[PDB]
Structure formats: C-alpha cells, structure tokens
Amino acid sequence: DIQMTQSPSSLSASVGDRVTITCRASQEISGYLTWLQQKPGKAPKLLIYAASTLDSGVPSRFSGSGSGTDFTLTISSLQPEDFATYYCLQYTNYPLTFGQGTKLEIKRTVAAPSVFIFPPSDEQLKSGTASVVCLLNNFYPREAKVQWKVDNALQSGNSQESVTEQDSKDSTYSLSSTLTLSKADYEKHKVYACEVTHQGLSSPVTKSFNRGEC
Amino acid sequence: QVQLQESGPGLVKPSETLSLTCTVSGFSLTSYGVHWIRQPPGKGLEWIGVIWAGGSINYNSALMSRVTISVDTSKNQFSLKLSSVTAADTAVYYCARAYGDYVHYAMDYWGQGTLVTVSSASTKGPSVFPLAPSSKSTSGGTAALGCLVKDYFPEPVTVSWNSGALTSGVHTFPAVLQSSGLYSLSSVVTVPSSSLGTQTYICNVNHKPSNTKVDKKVEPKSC
Ligand code: NA
Ligand code: NA
Ligand code: NA
Ligand code: NA
Ligand code: NA
Ligand code: NA
Ligand code: NA
C-alpha cells in the first residue's frame, strides 16, 4: 500500500485568500495523482487528474502541481462555494489509496442569528410527548450559547443541538436546539423560553411562548 | 450524459451478505468499468475494487476474500457483494467510472452513494410533526417553518418541500441520536411572512429503509 499523507487535516481561510493543500506519497507515483472535492452530503467530485490537469468545467482558480512524492493543490482566490473536504488519490499502484482529507473552512465576518421558536404540535402532544424547537438561523461564528428556561428555571439534560455545515453561499451556520418533555412534564409549566448568547448580539435574545396560548 | 446510480438494501443484519448494484448510462461498457469505494460516516474513503471493460477484476486485498464483483452488460448494471458483514462495514458505498491501462487506473464520475447500515436491530419509520409558523417564528417579512422528523432507524431520511418546488432557504439539520437509540432531525425553511394564508407548505419525508413516505402539511399557529 502507498500511504497518502495530506496536510493540513483542517484549514480555515478568508474569501479571496490563496490556500495550499499538500499530499505526500510514501512511494513515487510518477504523476498519477488526482484531487477530489467533497461537499457535505454529496459524492466526491473530480477536480484535477494527472497531478496538474484541470477537469472540464472546474474553475481556473484551482491548480495542481508536484511530481514524484510531493504534490500540492492550490486555490488562488478562495470562494465561499469552495467549502468542502479535499482528497488526494494515487492511482498508479493497487490498491488505490486516498489521503485522509483536508476540511477547508471559510472565515467570514461575525453575523448575528435570527432566533425563532416553535411550540409543540397537537399531533405530537396527542402521542404523549412535547418537543420544543428553538432555531438560530444564518449566523457566524459557530460558537453559540442556547439555554432553555422553563418558568425562569434553567434546564439541563433534556435538549439536543444540531448545527448545519457552512452555507455554500454566505458561509454561515444554522442551529437547532430541541427540548423534549413528556406531555405530563410539559403540562407542569407555563413559560417556555430559549435564551441565545452570540458574538453578533449586543445582549442575549429570548424567544418564548406560554403553553396553551397558541 | 454519464450517469451512475447505486442501489442497496439500507439495513443489513450482521454476518449476512451485502448486495449492491450500480446502474449506468451514457457511456460504452466496452471502454469503461467501475470502481467501488466506500466511506464510513465521518471518515475517509477506502477503495474496494474495480472491474474493467474486458472483465478483468482487481481487489483491495484487505477485503478480497469477502468481495465479489461482476457486470451484466445487458442490464447496464455492475454489482458488488460483500459477505459476512459487521458494523465495520457500515458506510456509504459509491461506484465510480473506471478507465485506464496497465500503468494508470483512473476514475472520474461518481454516483451519489448508498448508505448501508449493519445492525441487528429492526427498521423503524419516522413520525413527522409540524413546526408551525407564528409571530414567534417571524422577523419582519420573514417567517420560519419546518418539520420535525422523529424516531427512525437507520439513516437516512430525505426531505423536500412542496415536492421540490421550495428549495431556497431550506436547512435540513444533520440527524441526532436520541437516548432511545433512534435518530431525529428537523427541516426548516424561511418563507415570506405574508404568504402564510395564501401558500400551502408541505414537507415530503422519505425513509427508504422502512418504505415510509410521509407528506405533512405545515399550518400556521396564532401566537
Ligand atoms: Na510504503
Ligand atoms: Na414523539
Ligand atoms: Na466558526
Ligand atoms: Na448541513
Ligand atoms: Na449576546
Ligand atoms: Na442485501
Ligand atoms: Na483511506
């Protein structure tokens, strides 16, 4: 096996920056080195083959060089849609082997979240459970503090967070916090609130509702 | 136009044999073959093997004893069998078009992949609940609405809005494990807040492993 060593394993850069990703092969692979781009949720896409040949349709800001054991992928003006994991692949020797991947993250300016809250649906309540969903939409950086307050009492142990990958156009994140109670527990309190603290907010924002008012 | 389409079972019980097909169109099976690659969730890529235009096969020797690769040119479909599967074989399985000679073994176009989950457990379809828009999900001229897709196994579920006509502003969150061992996710979309009484919003949930297809209308609330 030829071991393909990629560096760095992750990488953050601003839009417009030049970024460089290198691949080292444990043995000489001549020029049979391909670079692949994998956007979240999708299959890998061919960027460059034969170390330096751009595939038809790939933007000219991508460029590949190197020979023997040391190869480089260059993006000359990083664009938001270039957020992805990049893989090198040698294909001169069986088994084909990939590098471990470089995840390229985009630095952008601070962006405040828009905060939305959803009361539980009657359909779910009829089944004995109450999920309350708090939505933070299109914000940056990723670090965010979401706290559930139930009748002004901070909750723990009954919520879960999910964050999207950076948006391919504006590099922001979105986040969901989901508070799940049994119907009996849910019916013991009135005010359901999520309080959000984020770099882009000058003071924490609270979105709330009273049970049964919707 | 070159197309490759994988098809798999979704859930496979341990020690059984995984059976995958890749159906192709747009190129000559006398000049191209396919590679098989897999990707465990969150991890890198691992080449499994390749079948060449003339029928020659090359294996990843680590998996060779369990792997069987073949072609049926009348069906335009390639196949991969992986026997005695374990949780180590849970992954997205891709096929990719193969070309080359005896010195280079290139690959260009991939299919979109199929997620194989190896588990003793039985499949379970999701419950879909509305996340209703209201003043509490409205900022100015923008309102947010969504679908909570709850208590399914295994991954994945796909979510579209209004049969694919609503794509702008959709966020389908990555699934999260619950302490019950079942997954849960939300799909949200921001729409114009003046449209809540004139445009119907329906999320379309498809959980293929359980052959479950749900369309849920999301109606507003009044708070
Ligand atoms: Na070596
Ligand atoms: Na439930
Ligand atoms: Na960040
Ligand atoms: Na995402
Ligand atoms: Na704050
Ligand atoms: Na199977
Ligand atoms: Na690998």
Author numbering:
A (entry chain L): 1 to 214
B (entry chain H): 1 to 82, 82A, 82B, 82C, 83 to 100, 100A, 100B, 100C, ...
Please share text taken word for word from the publication where this structure appeared:
Murine mAb 44H10 was shown to target an epitope on the HLA-DR molecule conserved in humans, suggesting its potential clinical benefit across populations irrespective of HLA haplotype. Using a structure-guided approach, we identify and restore framework residues that directly interact with the antigen or indirectly modulate antigen binding by shaping the antibody paratope and engineer a humanized antibody with affinity, biophysical profile, and molecular binding basis comparable to that of the parental 44H10 mAb. Here, we describe the structure-guided humanization of mAb 44H10, leveraging CDR grafting methodologies further guided by critical insights derived from the structural characterization of both the parental antibody and intermediate humanized candidates.
While V17 exhibited binding to BJAB cells, we did not detect binding by V14, although both mAbs shared the exact same light chains. Conversely, the overlay of the V14 Fab crystal structure with that of parental 44H10 revealed greater deviations in the conformation of select loops, with the HCDR3 displaying RMSDs up to 8 Å relative to the parental structure. Given that the HCDR3 sequences in parental, V14, and V21 Fabs were identical, we hypothesized that differences in HCDR3 loop conformations observed in the crystal structures of these Fabs could be due to differences in support provided by the surrounding framework. Closer inspection of the structures revealed a slight but significant shift in the heavy chain framework region 1 (HFR1) of V14 relative to parental/V21 Fabs that could conceivably impact the directly adjacent HCDR3 loop. On the other hand, a valine at this same position in V14 was unable to mediate the same HFR1-stabilizing contact with L29, resulting in a distinct shift in the HFR1 loop. In contrast, a bulky phenylalanine found in V14 created steric hindrance preventing this HFR1-stabilizing contact. Differential scanning calorimetry (DSC) further investigated the effect of these mutations, where V71K/F78V mutations increased V14 Fab’s melting temperature by 1.6 °C, suggesting increased thermostability. Per-residue root mean square fluctuations (RMSFs) were calculated for each variable domain; in the case of V14, the V71K/F78V double mutation exhibited decreased RMSF values, primarily within the HFR1, HCDR2, and HCDR3, suggestive of lower flexibility and increased paratope stability.
